[PDB]
Design a protein around this ligand. Structure first.
Ligand SMILES: *[C@@H]1O[C@H](CO)[C@@H](O[C@@H]2O[C@H](CO)[C@@H](O[C@@H]3O[C@H](CO)[C@@H](O)[C@H](O)[C@@H]3O)[C@H](O)[C@H]2NC(C)=O)[C@H](O)[C@H]1NC(C)=O
Length: 197
């Protein structure tokens, strides 16, 4: 019986998601218990549906550059309310949610038996959003089959890495992050050996 939700607002967040916001229906006969959100790809087709207690929601795991038809209905103690007029929204184009290009191959200079100096430059593009931080991985080519992450974020374009094994060959690589995610790895640095203990 109750009217459809009012003041619906939707915006594409990124390539795979959009957020939806609305107001309580006017003059409800009974307390609103929740809402039901219906959406389908874009002549109507059978839609997916999500039930939520609040007046706003984020709809994720969508396809890039695709238009969606969205409707909302409120449910109360007297059944399902009237369904709002359909709203359309398009997820961002893939070129628009790009993560940054891989940073340039880093320069490496041995410092001690357990330390190494390292520096890098950003890539040709920051992607679709400015770089927020860098990440650094390392690997011992003689024994390791996989890269190891350094669980810190760097706003500098250089750093000194400590705690390495003495008399060991190492290589290093860098990735840049924006709000859209990680870049590919930089080229690996040239092999460099720590001083023996
Ligand atoms: C595009 O937008 C969507 C929606 O904002 C992003 O997905 C969301 O990513 C966040 C952060 O990773 C997720 O939050 C996390 O959820 C669980 C606990 O519920 C846990 O992994 C973390 O503690 C954190 O709270 C959120 O669930 C997720 N929402 C989805 C998938 O619907 C997405 O990362 C954005 N970027 C891209 C490139 O798609």
């Amino acid at each position: 019986k109750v009217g459809p939700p009012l003041d619906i607002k939707l915006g594409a967040l990124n390539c795979t998601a959009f957020s939806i916001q609305w107001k309580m229906p006017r003059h409800p006969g009974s307390p609103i218990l929740g809402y039901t959100v219906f959406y389908s790809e874009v002549l109507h087709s059978v839609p997916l549906s999500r039930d939520i207690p609040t007046t706003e929601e984020v709809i994720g795991d969508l396809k890039p550059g695709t238009e969606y038809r969205v409707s909302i209905a409120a449910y109360s103690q007297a059944g399902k309310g009237r369904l709002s007029s359909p709203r359309h929204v398009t997820t961002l184009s893939q070129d628009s949610c790009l993560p940054p290009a891989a940073p340039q191959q880093p320069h490496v200079i041995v410092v001690s038996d357990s330390e190494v100096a390292l520096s890098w430059k950003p890539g040709a593009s920051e992607g679709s959003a400015p770089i927020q931080y860098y990440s650094v991985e390392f690997i011992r080519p003689d024994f390791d089959k996989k890269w190891t992450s350094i669980h810190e974020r760097i706003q500098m374009d250089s750093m000194v890495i400590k705690g390495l094994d003495p008399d060991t060959n190492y290589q290093f690589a860098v990735r840049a992050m924006n709000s859209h995610g990680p870049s590919p790895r930089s080229w690996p640095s040239d092999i460099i050996r720590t001083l023996a203990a």
